[PDB]
Amino acid sequence: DRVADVIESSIGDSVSRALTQALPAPTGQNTQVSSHRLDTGEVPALQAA
Amino acid sequence: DRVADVIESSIGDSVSRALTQALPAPTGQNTQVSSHRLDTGEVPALQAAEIGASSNTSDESMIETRCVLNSHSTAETTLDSFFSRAGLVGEIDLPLEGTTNPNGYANWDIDITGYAQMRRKVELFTYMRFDAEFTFVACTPTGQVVPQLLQYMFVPPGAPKPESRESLAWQTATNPSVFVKLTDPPAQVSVPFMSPASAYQWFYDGYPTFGEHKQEKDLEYGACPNNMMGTFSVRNVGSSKSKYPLVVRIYMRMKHVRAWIPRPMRNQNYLFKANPNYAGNSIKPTGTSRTAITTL
Amino acid sequence: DRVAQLTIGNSTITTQEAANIIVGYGEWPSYCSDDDATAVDKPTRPDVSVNRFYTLDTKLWEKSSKGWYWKFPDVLTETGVFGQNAQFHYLYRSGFCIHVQCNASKFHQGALLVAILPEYVIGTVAGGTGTEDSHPPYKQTQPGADGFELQHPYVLDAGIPISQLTVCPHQWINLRTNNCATIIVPYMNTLPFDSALNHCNFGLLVVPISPLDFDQGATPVIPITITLAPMCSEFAGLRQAVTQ
Amino acid sequence: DRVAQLTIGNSTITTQEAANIIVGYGEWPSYCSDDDATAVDKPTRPDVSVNRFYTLDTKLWEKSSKGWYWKFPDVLTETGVFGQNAQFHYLYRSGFCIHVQCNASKFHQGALLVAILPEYVIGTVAGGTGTEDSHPPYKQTQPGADGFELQHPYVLDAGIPISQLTVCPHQWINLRTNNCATIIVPYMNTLPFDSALNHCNFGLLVVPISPLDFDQGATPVIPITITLAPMCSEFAGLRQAVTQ
Amino acid sequence: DRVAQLTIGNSTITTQEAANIIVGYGEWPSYCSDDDATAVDKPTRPDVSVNRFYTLDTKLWEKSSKGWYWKFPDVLTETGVFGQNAQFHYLYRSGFCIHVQCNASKFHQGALLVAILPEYVIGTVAGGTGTEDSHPPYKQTQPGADGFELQHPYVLDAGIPISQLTVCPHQWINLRTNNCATIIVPYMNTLPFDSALNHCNFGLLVVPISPLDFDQGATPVIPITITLAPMCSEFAGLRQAVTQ
Ligand SMILES: CCCCCCCCCCCCC/C=C\[C@H](O)[C@H](N)CO
Ligand code: NA
Ligand code: NA
Numbered sequence A: 001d002r003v004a005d006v007i008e009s010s011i012g013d014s015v016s017r018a019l020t021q022a023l024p025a026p027t028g029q030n031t032q033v034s035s036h037r038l039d040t041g042e043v044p045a046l047q048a049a
Numbered sequence B: 001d002r003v004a005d006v007i008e009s010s011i012g013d014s015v016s017r018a019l020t021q022a023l024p025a026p027t028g029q030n031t032q033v034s035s036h037r038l039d040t041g042e043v044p045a046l047q048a049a050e051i052g053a054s055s056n057t058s059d060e061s062m063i064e065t066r067c068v069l070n071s072h073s074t075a076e077t078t079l080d081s082f083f084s085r086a087g088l089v090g091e092i093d094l095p096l097e098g099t100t101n102p103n104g105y106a107n108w109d110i111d112i113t114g115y116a117q118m119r120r121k122v123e124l125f126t127y128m129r130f131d132a133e134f135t136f137v138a139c140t141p142t143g144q145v146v147p148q149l150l151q152y153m154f155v156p157p158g159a160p161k162p163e164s165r166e167s168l169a170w171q172t173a174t175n176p177s178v179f180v181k182l183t184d185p186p187a188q189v190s191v192p193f194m195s196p197a198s199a200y201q202w203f204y205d206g207y208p209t210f211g212e213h214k215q216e217k218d219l220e221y222g223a224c225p226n227n228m229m230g231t232f233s234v235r236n237v238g239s240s241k242s243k244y245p246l247v248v249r250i251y252m253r254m255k256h257v258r259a260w261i262p263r264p265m266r267n268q269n270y271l272f273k274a275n276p277n278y279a280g281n282s283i284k285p286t287g288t289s290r291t292a293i294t295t296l
Numbered sequence C, D, E: 001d002r003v004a005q006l007t008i009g010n011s012t013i014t015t016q017e018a019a020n021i022i023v024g025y026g027e028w029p030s031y032c033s034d035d036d037a038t039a040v041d042k043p044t045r046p047d048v049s050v051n052r053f054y055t056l057d058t059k060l061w062e063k064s065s066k067g068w069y070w071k072f073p074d075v076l077t078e079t080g081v082f083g084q085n086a087q088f089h090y091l092y093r094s095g096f097c098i099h100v101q102c103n104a105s106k107f108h109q110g111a112l113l114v115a116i117l118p119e120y121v122i123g124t125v126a127g128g129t130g131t132e133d134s135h136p137p138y139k140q141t142q143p144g145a146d147g148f149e150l151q152h153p154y155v156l157d158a159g160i161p162i163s164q165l166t167v168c169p170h171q172w173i174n175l176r177t178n179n180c181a182t183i184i185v186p187y188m189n190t191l192p193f194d195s196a197l198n199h200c201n202f203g204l205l206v207v208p209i210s211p212l213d214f215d216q217g218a219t220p221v222i223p224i225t226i227t228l229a230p231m232c233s234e235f236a237g238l239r240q241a242v243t244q
């Protein structure tokens, strides 16, 4: 009855897909206890600006 | 009781492990709706030809496609559709005066490799198994139909080939023969797959016999007896010279065809029957050429 | 997937720049069925002594090389225990695992087409004019382990286009990508068994489609080595050793 | 994650040295709500004919380049079917997928900052002394597809620090790491629709923060190509074609 | 597995070309049991102030270098808070996390053997002839943080073969593979605690087994840096600071 590319079409979506959400933050984040970590595979310090 | 490497051994497995399966495909594949895709990690367009496999990229992943219900048949590209068409494979002359079969009889060595059209098609595959339908169109060199009676005889390898029009071999006590007048419609007959092999080979990379293979015998390279089906003999059914010059054209139509291992299609002109020789000084490109690569 | 190891018999091949493995016509080598066979004598299946990797001669890839080819049952008929069985027995049957290896550097370039052409019949130039019905000599139709060089690669010395040679089990060795090609071939013939001496089931073609190139200073010697191993070898019809 | 493919319309982009994808302000382009709209006429949403990748001019990265910029609704107003719709219609709305590409070798070096600056208003040097109230010419505020070169990149030709330009959707092209930057921008303006001719929603800035460098002998021509695709394009207020 | 991060105390080490981590004799450093101890006074376990990464001097790898060694409790006795505790207390106990780092380029080559040899007693050449009972000076048996260079690496300056030094916790730095070696050593001694001044539990050996090499033009200065961190440090028997 109606062409498929029109049915499955997404032209018209008025809602903005947001990848992030606003969370409550009434105070500065806390710090948690940390111990030594001697391991391979996990590298928190290495980034890619 | 028995050594372990013998129990767990796999020597003897006669079943061929196949990685692929033949699926139904009566029509061309359909196209499904496709939308934009902006993401990392997935790259349909990128391939690696080194692997030796053709690109598996589909239309849908390269552009935004609509839905198309393809109902185009794939029936005309089956082996039977392709090969089941009679084509010229032999031509026999029976003139009155000359040096080519002037005694009212001829022996044609059964070989469909004498004509380019038919030959190029079959040489697309290495092996082929099939039954065939032979039709014999006879008339004079002008195309005139004459009231003459002929006898065609299939002489399997080993049977006595006729040495004259009145040869005793024409008694056909066992060989199959056909008696027709040129005024009757072309004789037609069905032939089975008569090779001692499981299929005919358009290419045989080897020699038929053992021993030293000297210069003089290189004539035998590529000659496979499993393809040599015998001789086709023709004659004027009589004991005197015919009143007219004749020609017999032989057409072949393949039926119930099986084919294996495709090969590159003939690139150069054919020169001989028993081999793929080509003119080394006239090696032409597969196709057309142009002035520059940046201009049509 | 870029790394691989091929172990068979008492031989192992290693590679860290492979491009998957091709299985000719989607079929693994196998032994002959009891209904596909005719010879009534019980065959010999030597296994480990013949189904192993044999490394044949090495070729040198030059900026002007045309390409080479090897006929297969043949290349091995005078080597190891496989050769002995191929000589003592009338009938032979087997598949092959072919591994062509050629490495360079990240600064060299070029592409080799490694393909398998069943029933690779060789033709001649017919005296140039095409009026002379000449035939290829024994030294060319069955070159042995030293292989033979192509004189007219464009037509594969057989009047057929190399551009279509890819309809056959093949693989490429693109120096910037991989340094070897692996092809597994099943036994292909119209007979269950055949002579390893008179008949060559297929031919291995190694042809440079994209010329080798590099700047002066980079090692100029770039070899192409051929290693191959029979698979599911079976022999029958025992007698004395025959060379040809 | 280093490899990616962007398909939209009848165009596809490939990359094997990417650095993820940035979605400006964490929002994907979308069409206008029925409650955010005012224009009562039904808009045109040409889809595939306008939402595809358009490749604008190429720039040459020199060891002394300062940087360039492109105003966006603008760069496309005279190209393809997008341009036609932008000219025939009064109102326009859309997001963009910007893909800046620039490759070199493992021996070249340098870093480009690719950023999106909304409402990128250009200022002038005010006659040098700062006593002359001069204004940027049409050729500079809306440079078209050829883009325009920055005269004082440190202040972005607008009296603002480039060192803080990273508070805007951006990405870097560090030759030793990636060879392209992909940024997806939603429609940003204080109005649901606006003129594609009089207003430029944002500007694309490509600026060398770490100078290009290499040793003599390595190819010296290092281009920077800009490819961009509209997304969720909507037009309204039809009339005759207007150029400006 | 090629990348890693070692965080301990207020120090962090990074690496992108590692070769896993070795844990000497399959045991992690631990504190002394209540049944393995004798000293009755309560020990000090300063934790974060002493269990952190200390980076000692850097050595230069030359095409003719023989190798160096460092005695361990020793190298740290005059550094940071670890040194202070080692001087003020009679008894000391601890394990170590040793990280030797040395990077080059994809065009340099060479291999260093980084090993830990417990109770590494140094011998002398005995006056060459072997008739003089000479002994190694304090400067050589306990070289401090500057380490000491081997005069006869083949015999490790102690009459034992270096070819067998791999029976000790070790790792290699093969420039074409990795640029660092990480070894974690537990406290090893026949006593639960001992003096950090008079006794050296083990020695760190860094020896070039495959000479460094490169073509003229590539940076010629290739340093080898030693970073190490104590683990589970415990001290007892407090008094005044003693240097030796
Ligand atoms: C009056 C009865 C006439 C009967 C004629 C029967 C003809 C049967 C012909 C079978 C022909 C098979 C041809 C197949 C292969 C070619 O001969 C080879 N490729 C030639 O090298
Ligand atoms: Na919206
Ligand atoms: Na089988």
Ligand code: NA
Pocket (backbone or CB within 6 Å): B054, B055, B056, B057, B058
């Ligand atoms: Na395809």
Ligand code: NA
Pocket (backbone or CB within 6 Å): B027, B028, B029, B030, B069, B070, B071, B072
């Ligand atoms: Na269909």
Ligand code: NA
Pocket (backbone or CB within 6 Å): B162, B163, B164, B166, B167, B168
């Ligand atoms: Na006769």
